[PDB]
Amino acid sequence: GVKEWECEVLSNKNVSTFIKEFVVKLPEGETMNFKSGSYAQIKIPKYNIRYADYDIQDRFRGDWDKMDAWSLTCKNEEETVRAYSMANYPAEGNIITLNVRIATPPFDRAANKWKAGIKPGISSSYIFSLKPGDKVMMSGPYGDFHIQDTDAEMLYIGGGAGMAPLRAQILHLFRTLKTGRKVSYWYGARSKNEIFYEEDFREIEREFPNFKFHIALSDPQPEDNWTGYVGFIHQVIYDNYLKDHDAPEDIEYYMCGPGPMANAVKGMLENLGVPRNMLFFDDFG
Numbered sequence: 001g002v003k004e005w006e007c008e009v010l011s012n013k014n015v016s017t018f019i020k021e022f023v024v025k026l027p028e029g030e031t032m033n034f035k036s037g038s039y040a041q042i043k044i045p046k047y048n049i050r051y052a053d054y055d056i057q058d059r060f061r062g063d064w065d066k067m068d069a070w071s072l073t074c075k076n077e078e079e080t081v082r083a084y085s086m087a088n089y090p091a092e093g094n095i096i097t098l099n100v101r102i103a104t105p106p107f108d109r110a111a112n113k114w115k116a117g118i119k120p121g122i123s124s125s126y127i128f129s130l131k132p133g134d135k136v137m138m139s140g141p142y143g144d145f146h147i148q149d150t151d152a153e154m155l156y157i158g159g160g161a162g163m164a165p166l167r168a169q170i171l172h173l174f175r176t177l178k179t180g181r182k183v184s185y186w187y188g189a190r191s192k193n194e195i196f197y198e199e200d201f202r203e204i205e206r207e208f209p210n211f212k213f214h215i216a217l218s219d220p221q222p223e224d225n226w227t228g229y230v231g232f233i234h235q236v237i238y239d240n241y242l243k244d245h246d247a248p249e250d251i252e253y254y255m256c257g258p259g260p261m262a263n264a265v266k267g268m269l270e271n272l273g274v275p276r277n278m279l280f281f282d283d284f285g
């Protein structure tokens with residue numbers, strides 16, 4: 001039993017192909033005190049929705065056409081609660097920003113459809129239907145995933161909607177603390193179109209020599225005209241930075257992203273002789 005507001009939705013626009021930037025506001029003069037990397041919880045009610053009702057911009061709708069995502073529907077028959085990480089820094093109290101990955105079902109290559117009779121994500125699917133002016137019930141903060149009090153080097157590894165916690169921590173580190181720690185953020189996206197929040201970080205690195213941001217694309221598309229790093233995030237990170245680093249084991253690793261990306265990083269660190277307690281992982285489950 002924890003703190004709960006009803007919030008108005010300011011903005012639910014697509015920020016990549018499958019991540020909406022979901023922005024809600026607390027009642028006037030209300031505020032959520034949280035530490036960066038904590039998460040909140042949305043009440044998802046009973047409901048019904050067709051994916052054909054979703055608002056997607058010209059440049060993101062392309063993959064939805066390909067996969068026939070517009071044909072999906074989702075019925076939720078029991079009220080529930082779901083976790084989403086805060087993506088803005090704690091200095092903004094009543095405009096909470098979230099990053100929501102729409103949980104499409106598995107794609108059954110055998111019939112070239114989605115695996116039949118499997119429901120999409122009852123929570124992500126509801127949030128995606130939300131529009132400016134709507135109301136959501138939200139509680140927080142929760143969670144333990146926080147910056148360590150050290151002078152240590154930090155290396156951030158993000159993937160997918162795992163942007164949320166890192167960005168909150170990195171924004172806190174540089175916009176409010178104005179830290180002197182050395183900090184790199186390596187974010188992996190499938191292609192150029194799927195990057196977001198880039199300028200936020202280009203700004204920071206222009207003000208702080210001690211911060212670097214690198215993007216690595218796993219499946220770059222011809223239209224990207226892509227001159228930068230390419231491949232798996234852990235491969236990119238190891239190939240360029242770590243391999244030649246004097247002491248990888250003195251670094252704190254903050255990562256958030258999907259199971260494959262995390263596990264492949266874990267296995268990499270392990271061989272590299274980095275001890276488990278130097279890795280801080282926020283598990284989206």
Ligand SMILES: Cc1cc2nc3c(=O)[nH]c(=O)nc-3n(C[C@H](O)[C@H](O)[C@H](O)COP(=O)(O)OP(=O)(O)OC[C@H]3O[C@@H](n4cnc5c(N)ncnc54)[C@H](O)[C@@H]3O)c2cc1C
Pocket residue numbers: 039082083084085086099100101102103104105106118119120121122123124125143161162164165283284285
């Ligand atoms: C601490 C924490 C923080 C988190 N922060 C974020 C965040 O900041 N942003 C974010 O996007 N997510 C975050 N997550 C994940 C998020 O909470 C949800 O898990 C995510 O939104 C998907 O849940 P859902 O209700 O939308 O889908 P669910 O109904 O939970 O289903 C998830 C997926 O499973 C599939 N599925 C359902 N049944 C089957 C089946 N029978 N066989 C095969 N597949 C099936 C669905 O198609 C769907 O793709 C966080 C999780 C935790 C624990």
